[PDB]
């Protein structure tokens, strides 16, 4: 049946976007929140809201029963999953359909059929989608990986067929590496990725991530609503994206628009989606994936294609055919910058913190989507994204001038962000391009970019002169306006307060244990280095350990960080087991 009241099973900027889309479409809207999120803007924006409880996602957004109970108690007849959490969960999409609630997404069979890399390989081959050389079926062993190297050469990429997240993709240069990579990658495949399935492909040195937005109805009509290039990936997750894909031949552009529909028809896919391809140096388009979540990057393709891309999901969940018969014109150009709590100067590491000020850019060509505001708090429970800055203009040059200005208007205070990185790439020749190709590529940030971003200092006083109070005033000189910062106790002339009796200035010590190189205590306790969830534990009481041996894995902001023994000994007491939330400084274990 038709949607009337939609529940958004998600948090933050996508929850705000989906609630807005529903309220636009005239639906009533229901939010759910975990306890860490009880006051984020989306909770206040939905027409109604319900508490899941739980500190963690596993205590909260991932609990199928709690999400169905939320739908039952609210009477919300439809569920939208957003992205992450249960959006890719075939078993949840099944459970909600079996519960009789209108699933705003593709069929459980479609999700399960797309969700395995080898079935995706086979069905994409059946569609004859453009594809890279590689072994078309799982390999047994290191010596069978060598059977591909004996035909297509090097470099060799390997994947766990249920690996992902940027974790499961490796490259090899030699045959002697292979036993180490196999007895590692299959260990990870079985223990962490739950499945020892792995396969092999031709590596691309500096490819571009090129993708196409696909829309399909329950009646099999399929549209390619546009394309992006996203090749600014910090690892394998994305940071800066743009629409359309620049700098490609019309033959490639039409090959993309043709192949995407065929992939959708061979899968039987319906709803919103996107198909991910890599464009190689040989210009070969090569399919990787169709994701079933509506992608974060939808709004740049909204700003180009004019259509709302989320609303189509509601209409297709009603089963109404597409209102528009044709591929829209990708008028102008658009950029998007992901705004994240990550320190680029610390080497793109996530860090939690307060948002003590959030002045978003506004004006021409600028759209802001955010899950945070002045006064928000970000904890280690969820991924780093704060917002998206979307910029549009008459051409890539004009949109980049818009970006250069907008990112200079942007200020965020209270936590580290990637905005200093965006401000660089929007003025880096390697991303401006020469008008015929990019030098930017899927490995560029980690290697070729000259990182000029200084590590985030916050407001901390760091040097001796930073300790001195300051008063900052406006003084107007010749009719100019100057903003001027005066120390509180500088000496000029005979001035009073040029000194104080008994008062000393010195460089303050950082709020770090011991000296800067005294990273750990001489004591026996292994103390948790960060706020997170204890996601793995690797030892039993009385087990022998040596310095550098793993003791636990902590998930902070969905970055898994290993925490290791600082001395040899045995863990004589252990305080936690997996799934526990853990605070900074908590004793995990004592090694004696």
């Amino acid at each position: 049946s038709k949607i009337s009241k939609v529940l958004v099973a998600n948090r933050g900027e996508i929850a705000v976007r989906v609630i807005r889309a529903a309220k636009d479409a005239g639906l009533a809207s229901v939010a759910v929140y975990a306890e860490p999120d009880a006051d984020a803007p989306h909770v206040r924006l939905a027409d109604e809201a319900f508490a899941l409880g739980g500190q963690t996602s596993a205590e909260s957004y991932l609990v199928f029963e709690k999400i169905l109970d939320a739908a039952e108690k609210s009477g919300a007849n439809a569920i939208h999953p957003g992205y992450g959490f249960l959006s890719e969960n075939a078993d949840f999409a099944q459970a909600v359909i079996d519960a009789g609630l209108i699933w705003i997404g593709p069929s459980p069979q479609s999700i399960r059929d797309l969700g395995d890399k080898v079935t995706a390989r086979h069905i994409a081959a059946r569609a004859k989608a453009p594809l890279v050389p590689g072994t078309p079926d799982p390999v047994k062993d290191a010596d069978e990986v060598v059977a591909f190297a004996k035909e297509h050469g090097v470099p060799v990429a390997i994947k766990a067929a249920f690996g992902g997240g940027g974790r499961g993709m490796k490259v090899a240069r030699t045959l002697e590496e292979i036993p180490e990579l196999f007895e590692s990658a299959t260990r990870e495949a079985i223990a962490a990725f739950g499945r020892g399935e792995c396969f092999v492909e031709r590596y691309l040195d500096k490819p571009r991530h090129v993708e196409a937005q696909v829309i399909a109805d329950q009646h099999g009509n399929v549209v390619v609503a546009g394309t992006r290039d996203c090749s600014l990936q910090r690892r394998f997750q994305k940071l800066v994206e743009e629409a359309p894909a620049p700098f490609l031949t019309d033959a490639q552009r039409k090959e993309i628009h043709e192949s995407a529909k065929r992939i959708c028809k061979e899968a039987g896919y319906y709803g919103a989606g996107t198909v991910e391809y890599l464009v190689g140096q040989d210009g070969l388009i090569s399919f990787l994936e169709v994701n079933t979540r509506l992608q974060v990057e939808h709004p740049v393709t909204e700003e180009t294609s004019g259509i709302d891309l989320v609303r189509q999901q509601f209409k297709i969940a009603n089963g109404e055919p597409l209102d528009i018969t044709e591929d829209p014109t990708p008028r102008g150009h658009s950029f998007e910058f992901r705004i994240n709590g990550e320190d680029a100067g610390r080497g793109f590491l996530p860090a939690p913190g307060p948002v003590t000020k959030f002045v978003a850019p506004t004006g021409p060509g600028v759209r802001m989507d955010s899950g945070v505001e002045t006064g928000s708090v970000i904890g280690g429970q969820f991924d780093s994204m704060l917002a998206k800055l979307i910029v549009t203009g008459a051409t890539r040059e004009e949109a980049l001038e818009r970006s250069r200005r907008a990112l200079a208007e942007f200020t965020v205070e209270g936590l580290a962000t990637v905005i200093p990185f965006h401000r660089a790439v929007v003025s880096d020749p390697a991303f401006i391009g020469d008008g015929e190709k990019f030098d930017v590529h899927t490995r560029w940030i980690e290697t070729e970019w000259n990182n000029t971003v200084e590590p985030f200092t916050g407001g901390d006083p760091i040097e001796e002169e930073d300790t001195v109070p300051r008063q900052t005033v406006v003084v107007e000189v010749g009719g100019r306006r100057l903003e001027v910062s005066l120390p509180g106790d500088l000496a000029i002339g005979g001035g009073g307060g040029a000194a104080a009796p008994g008062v000393v200035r010195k460089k303050p010590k950082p709020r770090k244990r011991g000296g800067g190189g005294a990273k750990a205590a001489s004591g026996d306790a292994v103390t948790a280095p960060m706020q997170g969830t204890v996601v793995k534990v690797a030892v039993e009481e009385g087990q022998e350990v040596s310095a550098g041996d793993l003791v636990v894995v902590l998930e902070a902001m969905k970055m898994e960080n290993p925490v290791t023994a600082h001395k040899d000994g045995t863990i004589t007491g252990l305080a936690v087991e997996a799934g526990a939330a853990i605070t900074q400084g908590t004793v995990i274990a004592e090694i004696k």
Binding site: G478, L482, V484, G496, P501
Partner: protein, 69 residues
């Protein structure tokens, strides 16, 4: 390691810089000779109070006030 004056927005010309600094230097009013003043405890308030013969404030107020330097 000194704390310097900072100008945060715009750049004045050398003439505007000189005028700004000159007026701020003129605004630097004070004693012209800031140093530790001459000690004179004659008739200090702590000598005026009545202390019980056994009052601990004879240590922690009266004596410390006289002896502190």
């Amino acid at each position: 390691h000194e704390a310097h004056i900072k100008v945060l927005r715009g750049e004045p010309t050398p003439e505007e810089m000189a005028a700004l600094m000159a007026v701020l230097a003129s605004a630097g009013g004070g004693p012209a000779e800031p140093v530790k003043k001459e000690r004179n405890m004659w008739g200090h308030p702590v000598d005026k109070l009545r202390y019980s013969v056994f009052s601990w404030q004879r240590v922690t107020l009266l004596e410390r006030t006289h002896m502190r330097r």
